[PDB]
Ligand binder design. Sequence first.
Ligand code: ADE
Ligand code: ZN
Length: 313
Amino acid sequence: YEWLNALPKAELHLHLEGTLEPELLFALAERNRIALPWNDVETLRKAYAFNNLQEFLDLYYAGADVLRTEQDFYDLTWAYLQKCKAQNVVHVEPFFDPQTHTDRGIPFEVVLAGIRAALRDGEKLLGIRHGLILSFLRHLSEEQAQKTLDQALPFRDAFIAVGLDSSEVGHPPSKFQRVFDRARSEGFLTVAHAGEEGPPEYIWEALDLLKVERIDHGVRAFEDERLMRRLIDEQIPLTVCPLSNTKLCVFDDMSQHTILDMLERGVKVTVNSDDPAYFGGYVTENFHALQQSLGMTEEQARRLAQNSLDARL
Ligand SMILES: Nc1ncnc2[nH]cnc12
Ligand SMILES: [Zn+2]
C-alpha cells in the first residue's frame, strides 16, 4: 500500500463533483444554509449503495446542490488536490460537469473561477500539473451541449479537452458528433466515456465519430476482439476505474476485473478513482484493490503508473 502510495501517478479519469465527501457536503450545506434530506453524514454515507450507473448518478447529481459559490468550487477542488499530494498524484486531468451547475442557475464563470483558483494552488504550492476537461451531460440534448460549448468559447484556453459522461446506455456518442466536431474545430481535444455500461459499438463510435484521444472506462472492449486488437495496436489509452466498476456492478467482484488481463495483452490501460467519494477510495486505493483481489505485482504496478504518465495530453 504505502509502496503503491509512493508511486508517482497521473489521474486522468476523475470527476471533481465525484470527490464530494459526505463531510464536505454537510459543511457546504451549513455554510449555504441548505436543509439536507439527509439526517446526518452517517445516513448520507449509507446511501452509497448502487446496483447500476443510474442509481449512482441520481445521488451524484443530488449532491451537487450544495455547490453554490466560487468558494464552494474552490473547496471542492482544493480538497481533492490535497488528496493528490498525499497520494503522490503529480498530474491531474479532471472532469467537471458545467451543466449540472449552470442549469441550477450558477454562473459558468463562478464554477470555473473556483476550480481554476484551486488548480493554480495545486500547481504553485503542490507541484501538480493539470489539464481541466469540460464534460457534457450525455442524457441531455446535443443542443444543450452546444449552448454549453458557446459559454466555453471565451474560456477555451482553460480546457485541454471536452469529455462526455452521464447515462451511457441509449445515449450513444453519435448523438453528440456535431458538438464534438465543433469543439475540435475550436481547438479542443476530445475524450469520452465508452463501454462502461454501453456496448463495444459505443467505443467504436467514440473512436471514429468523436475522435477521442482516450477511452474512459472502456472495459467492455473486452467482448470485442477486433477492437482489442485495435486498442493494442494504436496504444489508445484506457482510463479504467476499478472501484467504480465494482460499486456500479459492472463486475460482480474485483476478482473478476479484466484490467490486468488487458495490461498483459498490451492494452495501454491506466488506474483512476473516477468518483472517489462515492466509491470509497482514491487512486492509491484503486491500485491496492488490484493487488488484493487480483494479486497485481509491483511489476504491473509500475507499468500502470507509467502508462498514466505516458497518456497525459
Ligand atoms: N463514471 C461515470 N460514468 C458516467 N457518468 C458519470 N458521472 C460521473 N462519473 C461518471
Ligand atoms: Zn467517470
